[PDB]
Design a protein around this ligand. Structure first.
Ligand SMILES: Nc1nc2c(ncn2[C@H]2CCN(C(=O)CP(=O)(O)O)C2)c(=O)[nH]1
Ligand SMILES: Nc1nc2c(ncn2[C@H]2CCN(C(=O)CP(=O)(O)O)C2)c(=O)[nH]1
Lengths: 150, 149, 150, 142
């Protein structure tokens, strides 16, 4: 059974993470991990009041049991004083890759499954591995037939 | 901590509860416990395609140190073949009265706290006793100031 | 032409209606037109602090160019000091029926189309006649495939 | 007089915008004007399968961070256009860019190559990232 994440709950969690990342002056800017961290990055940037937002674009595809990682666009630096935000961490693969690119950055997510959980600096919601997360940008409001009808 | 419930989530839970009330034909109608149950009742009504929807309106008169229960408007029958529905059960204070008016009814809620759990026939979500549930009809979409300037 | 009504927007509309119905003291209760008026009625009931909420249940099976009406259940009275509410007005068929069985009732809706427009006492939003209104209780948040491949 | 925009509504408009920008292969990437364009840019990035998303941060109008090129083959996205102070500025850095917003006001209308929703000029747009689902007192007591 999948975990439905609506926009309202995302924003609640995003604000729960924002306050825990106070003060706002200890952070220089924000790096969002495209595309998953884009919205959480936007949300953080609004709350913490940060206007400098950049993106690192990483493309990943599975070829059976191995991953193919392609960084299409990178932000410069060791990550000094920035926050790196992604929507969720599952196995922790993307995290370890970001950690190589930005060894001196604070890495955050909204959701974290048990495996990837310890590989984050901070997160908000716990999810178990067997659970799939539907993010709001993948969903919509559409007609849904009744259960009976009658 | 305060548990926030959005319309969307209420609908998701209402739909789960609804499937557990299949098939629809065993039900004559639906009695909503005003006011909390009105929206859950409405959603159930749609999902099951039940058009016979009635209400029970229950208010509380306080006398000296004790709270009495006034019944402003009540449906008919012993609730035989009916689903009775409230938004939640916290203590079951109101839920005692509903059983007495409708003994032969299927009494359901969306949320339930531990002390009110044995009072319903079925519910969807467990909530801790210390937790306040904010329902979406008590909320709205309003400007929230940022956290930094 | 399809008009999407989310729960948030509906609440906004219902709240605008409720404040136009102030003060609440002039009303002795609410009669909801099942099933469409159930939710709007519940929202009025909350905003006006009205605990006396009853229903009128009507079945409208459409046989070609004629309609068969069935009143499954009917709140008592002429509607004196009562608000009767449906979600929307379309042709005025339901409205003429309510007006007969509740002549001294203040009959309101949220949406209205030009046809049934003169047959309500008050409404909130104008909807064009050729538009289908998708109400939130008939919808849900489910997955939606992206518009493009890749 | 306040135009309230919910996430669901923004997402619908963003999809109506995405459909106009089809086919998606005419695009090499998206440039979101932060912070207004971020979420719209993110939504377009999903609906159009575009993985190359970069930002331009304007703020006199000081440029905090930006990307190169003349915008040829890119989409520049902001949440709205009222006047065009930044819009006039965005035009410069990427002249051959396709520049879109979701909302557009009359005075800002001719500055963008495309938009989705018209809004009166005297109307304030309350974007969902500035709001939240909070308790709201009933309009009456009894
Ligand atoms: N929407 C969604 N995307 C998912 C889910 N699980 C994985 N992904 C996608 C999106 C984000 N992903 C990762 O960061 C891979 P990781 O470095 O090994 O943790 C994969 C899910 O349950 N839901
Ligand atoms: N969900 C939905 N229900 C509708 C619509 N149009 C009509 N109905 C349903 C629900 C309310 N209706 C009427 O008041 C019928 P009227 O006596 O001719 O005014 C029919 C619609 O666009 N959408």
């Amino acid at each position: 059974e999948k975990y439905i994440v609506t926009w309202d709950m995302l924003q609640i969690h995003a604000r729960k993470l924002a306050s825990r990342l106070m003060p706002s002056e200890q952070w220089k800017g924000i790096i969002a991990v495209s595309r998953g961290g884009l919205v959480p990055g936007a949300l953080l940037a609004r709350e913490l009041g940060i206007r400098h937002v950049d993106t690192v674009c990483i493309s990943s595809y599975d070829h059976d049991n191995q991953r193919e990682l392609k960084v299409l666009k990178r932000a410069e630096g060791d990550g000094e004083g920035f926050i790196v935000i992604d929507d969720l961490v599952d196995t922790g693969g993307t995290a370890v890759a970001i950690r190589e690119m930005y060894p001196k950055a604070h890495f955050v997510t909204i959701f974290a499954k048990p495996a990837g959980r310890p590989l984050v600096d901070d997160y908000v919601v716990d999810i178990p591995q067997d659970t799939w997360i539907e993010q709001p940008w993948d969903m919509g409001v559409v007609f849904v037939p009744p259960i009976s009808g009658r």
